[PDB]
Amino acid sequence: QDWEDAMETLNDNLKVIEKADNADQVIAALLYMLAAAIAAATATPPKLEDKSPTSEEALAFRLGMHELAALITKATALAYQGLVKEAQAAAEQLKTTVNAHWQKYRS
Amino acid sequence: QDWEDAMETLNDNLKVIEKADNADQVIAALLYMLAAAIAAATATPPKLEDKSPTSEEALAFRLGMHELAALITKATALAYQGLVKEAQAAAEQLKTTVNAHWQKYRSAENLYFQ
């Protein structure tokens, strides 16, 4: 999947998490988000199409995707413990961090 | 030897997944693969022994191992849902990707000058 596909998967699974009723649906959605965040870190967003992958700018992009994976993993740990509303709050919060990355690198 | 060892762990656990009878057996094998994929991205394969770790070619290698981690994680999501046949099919697909990475970065010395 290209970068925009991975971002769509993040968007689609955030919507699943906010409507979820039990931990298993929240964890499954977070695992799909984690896979997408890892994939996004290996892809090239539009704003970086012609940049050297070892540039400071490309590294900052990949680190930003790694930050998303950290937050997704923390929300997975909350949900694993049965703290489903807490994991849902964490997902709502990391929606804004995902959005920051999306807006920075899209188009 | 670290990269070759990780690749062996990937191949070993793909066989576990093919023989698995339930979701928990598949998930455990995928978690071992994910650990080996992450470890492999910190290793230097034979093809890159002489290159700067900050070179483009070394980064491309690391991102290729991260691609494998993403496929493994997706298979793990399928197995967590109970979609065992689907996770097994995803694993058969990532075997092809593991093979491609292995052929790209392994030592080619047996093939020199053929």
Add this chain to the structure above:
Amino acid sequence: QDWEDAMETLNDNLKVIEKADNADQVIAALLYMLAAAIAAATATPPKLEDKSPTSEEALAFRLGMHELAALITKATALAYQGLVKEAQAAAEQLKTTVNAHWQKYRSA
């Protein structure tokens, strides 16, 4: 968020694992450790404040954190199979790794 805050989360959750009685307690703590290791790889520790983020020294730091995430994930696989004592022994090994990394990268 601090590199130091991620190191504290790793330290805290190693104590949780050492006192655990069952696999789910170990798995939850390992997942918090995995989140912290990933987060730490995106931070700049004091030792690296004077270096380019694209330097070999910064890359070695990030790969040391990735190495820690691999060990954490392997301990999670052990605990997922019910091998609680094995997972706790793996955690004792990564205590050493976390300590070494802390000592290396703290202080400018």
